[PDB]
Structure 1
Amino acid sequence: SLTHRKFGGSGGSPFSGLSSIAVRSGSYLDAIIIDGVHHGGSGGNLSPTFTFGSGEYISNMTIRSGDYIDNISFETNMGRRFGPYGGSGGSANTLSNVKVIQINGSAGDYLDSLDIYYEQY
């Protein structure tokens, strides 16, 4: 049962555990790199790193996928953008008016899947 709980007091500046994203890509996603941690293979080309600003999160995302992840792009709540990186294959799936909380997935030599945890607004 997916849930969340808050602990502590008021104050401070909000932060997220999801701080940066990069990918390796060609016609598909070879890897995703989350907070600098590599998930997938060594093929494709390494994208620049997107580092979230304070109070910044993914609010819209387009993922093209079939048996693998083919393309990723996203926009943040501050209008910053990442991608598209990857190819033109797969089915396009969009998340809109969300707040992405976490990106998990599965990978081998390529990025097989993503499991995106998010709040839908």
Structure 2
Amino acid sequence: GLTHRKFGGSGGSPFSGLSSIAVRSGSFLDAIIIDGVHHGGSGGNLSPTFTFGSGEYISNMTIRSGDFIDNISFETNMGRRFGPYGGSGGSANTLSNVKVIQINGSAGDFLDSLDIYYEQY
């Protein structure tokens, strides 16, 4: 039942509600920072903030996952990369040739889970 609708005119500079991503990472992802909002704990080391340009979106992803999120790395449609950040635990999963719309999940002292909404090309 997923879809989208457009409202408004044709002007302005296109933006995404998913506008910037950073992480706190050690052996796991202690937190994911979405638009400067903290989602996780206080451990780990804070990575620099990746800010999407207008029309730039996540196109490729590799996630290492177990009971928590062990590692994350992604690439945008304009050739920019983020990570890999995290450890070697968990199991690997990938998203390829996509347009990531939204990054949700659950977090505590660590980043427990991620729910990525995306268009598959």
The 10-residue stretch of structure 1 (13-22 or 96-105) with the greater mean CA deviation from structure 2: 13-22
In structure 2, distance between residues paired with 1:26 and 1:52: 24
Counterpart CA distance in 2 for 1:16 and 1:62 is 21
Deviation at residue 6 of structure 1 after TM alignment: 1.1
Note the alpha carbon deviations across 1:53-86, whole angstroms, 9 max, x for none.
1111000011000110000000000000000000
Question: How many equivalent residue pairs?
Answer: 121
Report how far residue 104 of structure 1 moved: 0.5
Partner in structure 2 of residue 120 of structure 1: 120
Q: Quick one: distance in 1 between partners of 2:49 and 2:25?
A: 13
Aligned to 1:98: 98
Alpha-carbon offset, residue 9 of structure 1: 2.5
Hey, what does 1:78 align to over in structure 2? 78
Task: Provide the TM-score with structure 2 as the length reference.
Answer: 0.96
Partner SS, residue 17 of structure 2: coil
Q: Which residue of 2 aligns with 1:52?
A: 52
| 1:2 positional shift | 1.9
Q: Distance in 2 between matches of 1:15 and 1:41?
A: 28
SS in 1 for 2:67: coil
Structure 2: which 5+ residue stretches go unaligned?
none
Deviation for aligned residue 1:14: 1.9
SS in 2 for 1:114: strand
* 2: CA distance, partners of 1:92 / 1:58: 18
Q: Distance in 1 between matches of 2:10 and 2:48?
A: 35
Distance in 2, matches of 1:103 and 1:74, equals: 12
Alpha-carbon shift at residue 11 of structure 1 (Å): 3.2
For 1:13 and 1:51, the matched residues in 2 are separated by: 15
TM-score, reference length from structure 1 = 0.96
Q: After TM superposition, what 4+ stretches of structure 1 lie above 3 angstroms from structure 2? A: none
**1:91 & 1:5 partners in 2: Cα distance?**
36
